[PDB]
Each structure stands twice: as structure tokens, then as C-alpha cells.
Design an enzyme around this catalytic site. Structure first.
Site, PDB file in Angstrom:
ATOM      1  N   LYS A 212       0.838  -1.199   0.000  1.00 50.44           N
ATOM      2  CA  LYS A 212       0.000   0.000   0.000  1.00 50.44           C
ATOM      3  C   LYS A 212       0.876   1.253   0.000  1.00 50.44           C
ATOM      4  O   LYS A 212       0.643   2.188   0.757  1.00 50.44           O
ATOM      5  CB  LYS A 212      -0.925  -0.028   1.222  1.00 50.44           C
ATOM      6  CG  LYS A 212      -2.053  -1.013   1.104  1.00 50.44           C
ATOM      7  CD  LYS A 212      -2.405  -1.526   2.478  1.00 50.44           C
ATOM      8  CE  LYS A 212      -1.316  -2.461   2.946  1.00 50.44           C
ATOM      9  NZ  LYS A 212      -1.187  -2.444   4.406  1.00 50.44           N
ATOM     10  N   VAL A 213       1.861   1.294  -0.897  1.00 50.40           N
ATOM     11  CA  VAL A 213       2.925   2.297  -0.783  1.00 50.40           C
ATOM     12  C   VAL A 213       2.292   3.666  -0.926  1.00 50.40           C
ATOM     13  O   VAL A 213       1.502   3.894  -1.876  1.00 50.40           O
ATOM     14  CB  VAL A 213       3.992   2.073  -1.871  1.00 50.40           C
ATOM     15  CG1 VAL A 213       5.074   3.133  -1.765  1.00 50.40           C
ATOM     16  CG2 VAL A 213       4.578   0.627  -1.747  1.00 50.40           C
TER      17      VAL A 213
ATOM     18  N   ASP B 272       3.826   7.075   0.175  1.00 50.42           N
ATOM     19  CA  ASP B 272       4.735   8.119   0.647  1.00 50.42           C
ATOM     20  C   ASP B 272       5.094   9.091  -0.503  1.00 50.42           C
ATOM     21  O   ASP B 272       4.522   9.030  -1.579  1.00 50.42           O
ATOM     22  CB  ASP B 272       6.014   7.431   1.176  1.00 50.42           C
ATOM     23  CG  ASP B 272       6.616   8.128   2.346  1.00 50.42           C
ATOM     24  OD1 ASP B 272       6.758   9.377   2.378  1.00 50.42           O
ATOM     25  OD2 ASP B 272       6.931   7.397   3.319  1.00 50.42           O
TER      26      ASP B 272
ATOM     27  N   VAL C  95     -13.676 -10.299  -0.665  1.00 52.91           N
ATOM     28  CA  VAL C  95     -14.511 -11.491  -0.883  1.00 52.91           C
ATOM     29  C   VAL C  95     -14.576 -12.290   0.391  1.00 52.91           C
ATOM     30  O   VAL C  95     -13.536 -12.567   1.010  1.00 52.91           O
ATOM     31  CB  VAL C  95     -13.886 -12.392  -1.959  1.00 52.91           C
ATOM     32  CG1 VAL C  95     -14.632 -13.723  -2.135  1.00 52.91           C
ATOM     33  CG2 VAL C  95     -13.846 -11.639  -3.322  1.00 52.91           C
TER      34      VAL C  95
ATOM     35  N   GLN D 140     -15.454  -9.746   4.272  1.00 57.24           N
ATOM     36  CA  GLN D 140     -15.962  -8.382   4.147  1.00 57.24           C
ATOM     37  C   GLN D 140     -17.317  -8.308   3.435  1.00 57.24           C
ATOM     38  O   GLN D 140     -17.902  -7.240   3.330  1.00 57.24           O
ATOM     39  CB  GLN D 140     -14.943  -7.508   3.392  1.00 57.24           C
ATOM     40  CG  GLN D 140     -13.635  -7.331   4.160  1.00 57.24           C
ATOM     41  CD  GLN D 140     -12.680  -6.476   3.372  1.00 57.24           C
ATOM     42  OE1 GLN D 140     -12.995  -5.339   3.015  1.00 57.24           O
ATOM     43  NE2 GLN D 140     -11.488  -7.023   3.061  1.00 57.24           N
ATOM     44  N   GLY D 141     -17.781  -9.440   2.922  1.00 54.49           N
ATOM     45  CA  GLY D 141     -19.119  -9.492   2.335  1.00 54.49           C
ATOM     46  C   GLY D 141     -19.185  -9.653   0.837  1.00 54.49           C
ATOM     47  O   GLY D 141     -20.296  -9.864   0.288  1.00 54.49           O
TER      48      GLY D 141
HETATM   49  C1  LIG Z   1       3.781   8.693   4.993  1.00 54.70           C
HETATM   50  C2  LIG Z   1       5.166   9.212   5.313  1.00 54.70           C
HETATM   51  O1  LIG Z   1       5.133   9.968   6.512  1.00 54.70           O
HETATM   52  C3  LIG Z   1       6.000  11.127   6.709  1.00 54.70           C
HETATM   53  O2  LIG Z   1       6.632  11.398   7.721  1.00 54.70           O
HETATM   54  C4  LIG Z   1       6.091  11.996   5.552  1.00 54.70           C
HETATM   55  C5  LIG Z   1       4.904  12.584   5.156  1.00 54.70           C
HETATM   56  C6  LIG Z   1       5.009  13.612   4.235  1.00 54.70           C
HETATM   57  O3  LIG Z   1       4.007  14.238   3.793  1.00 54.70           O
HETATM   58  N1  LIG Z   1       6.216  13.967   3.784  1.00 54.70           N
HETATM   59  C7  LIG Z   1       7.352  13.367   4.192  1.00 54.70           C
HETATM   60  O4  LIG Z   1       8.425  13.760   3.721  1.00 54.70           O
HETATM   61  N2  LIG Z   1       7.318  12.360   5.070  1.00 54.70           N
HETATM   62  C8  LIG Z   1       8.535  11.620   5.505  1.00 54.70           C
HETATM   63  O5  LIG Z   1       9.409  12.519   6.181  1.00 54.70           O
HETATM   64  C9  LIG Z   1      10.782  12.326   5.761  1.00 54.70           C
HETATM   65  C10 LIG Z   1      11.231  13.578   5.006  1.00 54.70           C
HETATM   66  O6  LIG Z   1      12.662  13.361   4.871  1.00 54.70           O
HETATM   67  P1  LIG Z   1      13.545  14.462   4.075  1.00 54.70           P
HETATM   68  O7  LIG Z   1      12.769  15.021   2.930  1.00 54.70           O
HETATM   69  O8  LIG Z   1      14.748  13.662   3.647  1.00 54.70           O
HETATM   70  O9  LIG Z   1      13.891  15.535   5.052  1.00 54.70           O
HETATM   71  C11 LIG Z   1      10.777  11.082   4.916  1.00 54.70           C
HETATM   72  O10 LIG Z   1      10.893   9.944   5.793  1.00 54.70           O
HETATM   73  C12 LIG Z   1       9.373  11.111   4.336  1.00 54.70           C
HETATM   74  O11 LIG Z   1       8.987   9.789   3.996  1.00 54.70           O
HETATM   75  C1  LIG Z   2      -3.737  -1.501   1.017  1.00 59.09           C
HETATM   76  C2  LIG Z   2      -4.121  -2.953   1.198  1.00 59.09           C
HETATM   77  O1  LIG Z   2      -4.218  -3.588  -0.066  1.00 59.09           O
HETATM   78  C3  LIG Z   2      -5.195  -4.645  -0.318  1.00 59.09           C
HETATM   79  O2  LIG Z   2      -4.991  -5.695  -0.912  1.00 59.09           O
HETATM   80  C4  LIG Z   2      -6.510  -4.372   0.226  1.00 59.09           C
HETATM   81  C5  LIG Z   2      -7.148  -3.259  -0.290  1.00 59.09           C
HETATM   82  C6  LIG Z   2      -8.492  -3.130   0.010  1.00 59.09           C
HETATM   83  O3  LIG Z   2      -9.195  -2.166  -0.402  1.00 59.09           O
HETATM   84  N1  LIG Z   2      -9.086  -4.057   0.768  1.00 59.09           N
HETATM   85  C7  LIG Z   2      -8.430  -5.128   1.257  1.00 59.09           C
HETATM   86  O4  LIG Z   2      -9.059  -5.935   1.950  1.00 59.09           O
HETATM   87  N2  LIG Z   2      -7.128  -5.304   1.013  1.00 59.09           N
HETATM   88  C8  LIG Z   2      -6.341  -6.434   1.581  1.00 59.09           C
HETATM   89  O5  LIG Z   2      -6.862  -7.662   1.082  1.00 59.09           O
HETATM   90  C9  LIG Z   2      -6.969  -8.650   2.136  1.00 59.09           C
HETATM   91  C10 LIG Z   2      -8.452  -8.937   2.373  1.00 59.09           C
HETATM   92  O6  LIG Z   2      -8.406 -10.098   3.247  1.00 59.09           O
HETATM   93  P1  LIG Z   2      -9.800 -10.722   3.787  1.00 59.09           P
HETATM   94  O7  LIG Z   2     -10.789  -9.635   4.049  1.00 59.09           O
HETATM   95  O8  LIG Z   2      -9.367 -11.448   5.034  1.00 59.09           O
HETATM   96  O9  LIG Z   2     -10.303 -11.649   2.732  1.00 59.09           O
HETATM   97  C11 LIG Z   2      -6.272  -8.050   3.326  1.00 59.09           C
HETATM   98  O10 LIG Z   2      -4.864  -8.334   3.212  1.00 59.09           O
HETATM   99  C12 LIG Z   2      -6.492  -6.565   3.093  1.00 59.09           C
HETATM  100  O11 LIG Z   2      -5.468  -5.839   3.754  1.00 59.09           O
END
Ligand SMILES: CCOC(=O)c1cc(=O)[nH]c(=O)n1[C@@H]1O[C@H](COP(=O)(O)O)[C@@H](O)[C@H]1O
Ligand SMILES: CCOC(=O)c1cc(=O)[nH]c(=O)n1[C@@H]1O[C@H](COP(=O)(O)O)[C@@H](O)[C@H]1O
Lengths: 215, 215
Positions: A62-63, A65, A172, A175-176
Site C-alpha cells: 500500500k505504498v 509516501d 470477498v 468483508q461481504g
Molecule cells: C507517509 C510518510 O510519513 C512522513 O513522515 C512523511 C509525510 C510527508 O508528507 N512527507 C514526508 O516527507 N514524510 C517523511 O518525512 C521524511 C522527510 O525526509 P527528508 O525530505 O529527507 O527531510 C521522509 O521519511 C518522508 O517519507
Molecule cells: C492496502 C491494502 O491492499 C489490499 O490488498 C486491500 C485493499 C483493500 O481495499 N481491501 C483489502 O481488503 N485489502 C487487503 O486484502 C486482504 C483482504 O483479506 P480478507 O478480508 O481477510 O479476505 C487483506 O490483506 C487486506 O489488507
């Protein structure tokens, strides 16, 4: 993916996770591994699963950042052997592009999460989700995730991304969401608890597959 | 936090991360550790840092899943010794509540990320950020993160959360934010690369602190 079924392996113990995955391996070719397991047992679990089971591994991280940190997360994840990573689209196009760049560098894939499956997704994500999907298309994203719990949303997502894009769908069972309805629009379903908490996970997976074949 | 400065330790090598953190420890009392370091060296790095440096650790995990998975991620993170976790607000109130429940169970803290610092944050997050902040207030959140790169947004966030809430702010230095301006609104600044990529990290931290004292 085998049988259009992807196991969401969110058990937090290596022994339990290995047992369940081995029990259902005949019925899948793809395991989604997320932070519950990785933060409990380490990133080495990805290569262990890949090897033991010969499956594909999607790292559901769920990247979400800024671009520079996203780059680092993706690089670490692919170095650990993941075949693909799930990326949130809500942080915008530069954040997604950073993930795509690393995936291009390392010969891997990005899946864009467009609209989530839980009730809270209605508050902010749903209203942006069509745009998030169109952003994906414009960035060249080919793999997407959208919600089994809302098949009308899942239809709209399919409409935006077209028929050639690959779409997987969680929600599936527990969650329904319904396997058959979801597979009207998604190429594959993700299933976690309905399998991994079942008294007999293999029987649960088999039951789902039987209903999928019937489609 | 000591000197209102939190180190964002996003080096990906344990030796480099330990060296830099030790060099700047006289100037901080709080280290933010995120996925770049944890996914490269393991969750055990949190307790190692806590012990070696006697700092507080904020786990910047940007938690952004459905409620049940969020619960699992938070539990693993607090078991690893983190003092607080950063949570995205965009997945909505149930996702945030799940994190708050675990933090209440384990005597820890949640920080709500309301508006991000990078350019892509303008696409979807910014338009929801005031609402995300008001949701935080209504859930009882007391700790927030908002962007150094947009001090007018950081002023608006402070306005919503009030003077008693604690507000930390990344984007200082590399991303273009200014320490002094940001501290007009935030209680503490987060700084990563301007310190950890510097030829002399201690001198970089000292330089920042000198400008903070001047405020
Ligand atoms: C979801 C990441 O959470 C944070 O702390 C974060 C949110 C945001 O809006 N902006 C942000 O820069 N950060 C985090 O704060 C750090 C900023 O580092 P830097 O830019 O190198 O000074 C870095 O770890 C980045 O991932
Ligand atoms: C950011 C998580 O990414 C997903 O795969 C995810 C997105 C979403 O909208 N809903 C969702 O359920 N998932 C993930 O998919 C899985 C659902 O598992 P379950 O409900 O147990 O069948 C669980 O790992 C959950 O984190």
C-alpha cells in the site's frame, strides 16, 4: 492467476502461514503477502515462500509516501524477491511514477489501488477513485486493485481501465463480497480470512474454486 | 521533542543508520524510523535504536489499510517497541479508529497524517485534508503531521486542531521547507536528508538547532 484466486496470507506466525499456504497451494499460483506477516517474521519470508511454494508473490505494501521514499520502499521490496507491489494512488502521480520507475528498473510490476473495500473508503477515496484510475491509465499502469464489496464501483473501474488491464479484487468472503459477482469485472479475487481462518483451508479454497469454475 | 527536531532516519544500512544517529543524538530526543530502514534491516532495529540511543521512536508506517489489517500492523509495530505510529487519514474514520484502539490497548500514540508535503499531494489529498483533520479531531486524535512545504496549509491545519494538539512537520531542507517558518505552526520539524546525507550530520543538525533557538 491459477483459478483466478489469490491467497491473502495475513497470518502473523511463520509456522501457521507456511502450513496454510502449503495446504492450499494446489488451488492458487499467487500469494499476496502484506505487512502483518512481514513485520512479524521479516522480509526474508518473501523469498522463503517463493522458493517453497514456487508461487508469485504480490507485496501488499500500500505504498503511500513521497516519491523519494516510495523509490526506497520499492527497491527494498523487489530486492526481497517480490514479483509485484501494491501502490496507493491517492498520493498522486509523482508518487506512483516513482514506483513505476523502480519496477521498470528491476523488471517487476506495480498494482495501483484505486478504491478500497472497507466502509471508510466512502469518506475520501471513493470520490477520487475514478480520477485515480484515469491517472493510472495516463501513467501506463496495467494492473489495478478495486473493491469486491462494491461491484458497481468495480464495473466503473473496469470501464476506465479497459479490458486489457489486469484487475484484482479483495473483500470477498469476510468483508461481504461474492466470488462470482466480483469476477464479472475482476480477473482475479483476493481471499484472506475465509480461507486462512477456516477449519479446513483447503476445503474453503476448493469451495471457492468450484463456484469460480461454475461461472 | 528535544530542540523541536526529529531525525528522519531513512538510510537503508544498519551501520550507516547507527553511525549518523549516534553522531546527532546530542541534538534530538526522537527518531522517526520508516520502511526504508525496517524493510532493509528488520523490525528489531526499533528496539535496538531505542536501547542504544534512549530516544523515542516514531514508526512512520503511513498505515493505510482496512481496519482489520490496520489493527495487525499497529500491534506488530508496538510489539516491536515503537512509541508512536503515523497513520494516513485518507482511508477514513474506521481505519483510523482501528489504529487508535490498538494504541489505547498498548499505551502508545497515533499521529494522523493529514496533508502530504510532495507536489502530488495537490492532486487528491489537499482537497480532503481539512476534512481529514476535522475527522481526527472528532476521533480524539491529539498528534498530527502536515507539510513544511506549504506553511499556509500548515496554518490551516493548526487552526483546525487547536493549540493543545501536537503537530510535526516534514519537508524541511531537501524538499524546500524552512525550519523557522514551519515552527510558526508546528511544534517540531522532521528532517532527513539535510542531516543524514550531509558531509557532517552533527554540524547540519547543529546549524538547524541554532536557527531554531533564534526563533
Ligand atoms: C507517509 C510518510 O510519513 C512522513 O513522515 C512523511 C509525510 C510527508 O508528507 N512527507 C514526508 O516527507 N514524510 C517523511 O518525512 C521524511 C522527510 O525526509 P527528508 O525530505 O529527507 O527531510 C521522509 O521519511 C518522508 O517519507
Ligand atoms: C492496502 C491494502 O491492499 C489490499 O490488498 C486491500 C485493499 C483493500 O481495499 N481491501 C483489502 O481488503 N485489502 C487487503 O486484502 C486482504 C483482504 O483479506 P480478507 O478480508 O481477510 O479476505 C487483506 O490483506 C487486506 O489488507
Amino acid at each position: 492467476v491459477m483459478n483466478r484466486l489469490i491467497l491473502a496470507m495475513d497470518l502473523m506466525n511463520r509456522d501457521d502461514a507456511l502450513r496454510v499456504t502449503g495446504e492450499v497451494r494446489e488451488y492458487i499460483d499467487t500469494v499476496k503477502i502484506g505487512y502483518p506477516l512481514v513485520l512479524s517474521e521479516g522480509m526474508d519470508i518473501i523469498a522463503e515462500f517463493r522458493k517453497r511454494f514456487g508461487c508469485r508473490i504480490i507485496a501488499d505494501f500500500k505504498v503511500a509516501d513521497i516519491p523519494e521514499t516510495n523509490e526506497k520502499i520499492c527497491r527494498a521490496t523487489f530486492k526481497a524477491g517480490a514479483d509485484a507491489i501494491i501502490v496507493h494512488g491517492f498520493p498522486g502521480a509523482d508518487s506512483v511514477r516513482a514506483c513505476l520507475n523502480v519496477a521498470e528498473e528491476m523488471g517487476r510490476e506495480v498494482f495501483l489501488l484505486t478504491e478500497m473495500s472497507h466502509p471508510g473508503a466512502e469518506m475520501f477515496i471513493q470520490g477520487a477513485a475514478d480520477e485515480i484510475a484515469r491517472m493510472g491509465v495516463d501513467l501506463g499502469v496495467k494492473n489495478y486493485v478495486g473493491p469486491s464489496t462494491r461491484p458497481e464501483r468495480l464495473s466503473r473501474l473496469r470501464e476506465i481501465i479497459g479490458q486489457d488491464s489486469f484487475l484484482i479484487s479483495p473483500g470477498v468472503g469476510a468483508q461481504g463480497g461474492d466470488p462470482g459477482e466480483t469476477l464479472r469485472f475482476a480477473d482475479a479475487i483476493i481471499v484472506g480470512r475465509s480461507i486462512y481462518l477456516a477449519d479446513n483451508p483447503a476445503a474453503a479454497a476448493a469451495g471457492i474454486i468450484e463456484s469460480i469454475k461454475d461461472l
